[PDB]
Amino acid sequence: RPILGRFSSHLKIGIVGLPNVGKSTLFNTLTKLSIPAENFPFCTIEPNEARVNIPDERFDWLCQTYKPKSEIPAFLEIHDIAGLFLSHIRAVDGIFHVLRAFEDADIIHVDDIVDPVRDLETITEELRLKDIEFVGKKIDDVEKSMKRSNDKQLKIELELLQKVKAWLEDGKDVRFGDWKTADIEILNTFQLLSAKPVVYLINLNERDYQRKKNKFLPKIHAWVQEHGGDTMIPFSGVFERSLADMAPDEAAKYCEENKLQSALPRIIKTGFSAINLIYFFTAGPDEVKCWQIRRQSKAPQAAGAIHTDFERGFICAEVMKFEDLKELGNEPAVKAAGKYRQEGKTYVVQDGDIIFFKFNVS
Ligand SMILES: Nc1nc2c(ncn2[C@@H]2O[C@H](COP(=O)(O)OP(=O)(O)O)[C@@H](OP(=O)(O)OP(=O)(O)O)[C@H]2O)c(=O)[nH]1
Ligand SMILES: [Mg+2]
């Protein structure tokens, strides 16, 4: 039941990397595409934070079909981090790790050596080092507490912190550890940087992105295989900045004529292997909304993601498969074909489910 990383309602992503790799440029490109801050009346959105809708053909279709009063797509929350003070980074679920694989041509800087692998080793080392500093401080705190308290939980926390210190000093990320559920629950309270899952974004000039080729990609791929097997997505920051500034008509003409497409949709939809998510929808005249929950969630746990009271008071879940609704075309048709189902406490929610939850007010 415990897993590394405490996913709640949507992913929070930190953009990390060395200076001058295009982090703030990527962030500004995503800001142009973002949900305005007025749509979150319960939240204060910091200046280096953007909320961007996850594009989903299913979500668009449901909104055409139900014509709801309000449309709430799934979204991603993205934070631009300036350098590697650490409150911003500790809070995120996962990391977009941006690598420089772009080089200038006729006008160049002296000794401006591009080496993505060298940069990978530098930043991954720096995250583990910040974890070693954090774990060092917590070991001191626990040892001081253990002078005063007899409590068994302190002896457990200490044994774990020392196992983690040794793992990190051996150059290994916490997320590649074999942690028992008891350890995972303690690790999750620490929010260690090397415990967070990663997507690698490889920043290329627009020619290399259009060509679908770069000399550094095989070297990056090889390193990533020996250090976790995480997703790699090539992009061009300069191309995405230009494309986001064009009008829809100009953008389409540019992409047709030059034979390339935006990487941003793929980047926004990719998510993380360690954080295995599915979408379910609520749909009606008032609202169509996309909900994000852990794969293999049971119906009452999906209700809990709306609010704990709907889980605790759960009675049943009336479910349509998105496929069933799409092919029959409307809810009356789905009911007539007997594909509108009453599901119970043991039902395992499926990606694309359209759910009408029933609960007891007390
Ligand atoms: N060639 C190239 N350089 C990049 C790219 N992305 C970033 N840079 C370089 O790094 C500078 C900072 O860009 P940011 O996007 O703020 O980088 P950062 O947040 O990762 O530190 C840019 O300065 P700038 O003032 O925006 O540009 P410039 O006028 O100084 O060259 C530019 O020199 C890219 O995709 N291609
Ligand atoms: Mg920056």
Residue numbers in the entry: 15 to 98, 112 to 389
Authors' account:
AtYchF1 is an unconventional G-protein in Arabidopsis thaliana that exhibits relaxed nucleotide-binding specificity. AtYchF1 in Arabidopsis thaliana is a close homolog of OsYchF1, which possesses a noncanonical G4 sequence (NxxE) within the G domain, instead of the canonical NKxD in most P-loop GTPases, resulting in a relaxed nucleotide-binding specificity and the ability to hydrolyze both ATP and GTP. Similar to OsYchF1, AtYchF1 was also previously characterized as negative regulator for both biotic and abiotic stresses. OsYchF1 harbors a G domain at the N-terminus for GTP and ATP binding and hydrolysis, and a TGS (ThrRS, GTPase, and SpoT) domain in the C-terminus for nucleic acid binding.
The structure of AtYchF1-ppGpp with Mg2+ was resolved using X-ray crystallography at 2.07Å. In the structure of the AtYchF1-ppGpp complex, the ppGpp molecule was bound at the normal nucleotide-binding site of the G domain, as expected. The guanine moiety of ppGpp was engaged in π-stacking interactions with the Loop A motif, sandwiched between the hydrophobic chains of Phe129 and Val265 (corresponding to Ala265 in OsYchF1). The O6 of the guanine ring was recognized by the well-described side-chain of Asn230 of the G4 element. The α- and β-phosphates of ppGpp were coordinated by the G1 motif (P-loop), and an Mg2+ was coordinated by the β-phosphate and the side-chain of Ser38 in the G1 motif. The δ- and ε-phosphates, which were covalently bound to the 3′-OH group of the ribose moiety, discriminated ppGpp from its GDP counterpart by pointing away from the active site. A salt bridge between the δ-phosphate and Arg268 was observed. The binding of ppGpp had a greater stabilizing effect on the conformation of Loop A (Arg127-Asp142), with His136 as the most significantly stabilized. However, in the AtYchF1-ppGpp structure, His136 was stabilized by Asp131 which had a hydrophilic interaction with the guanine moiety of ppGpp. Interestingly, the distance between the TGS and helical domains of the AtYchF1-ppGpp complex is 4.7 Å shorter than those in the OsYchF1-AMPPNP or OsYchF1-GMPPNP complex.
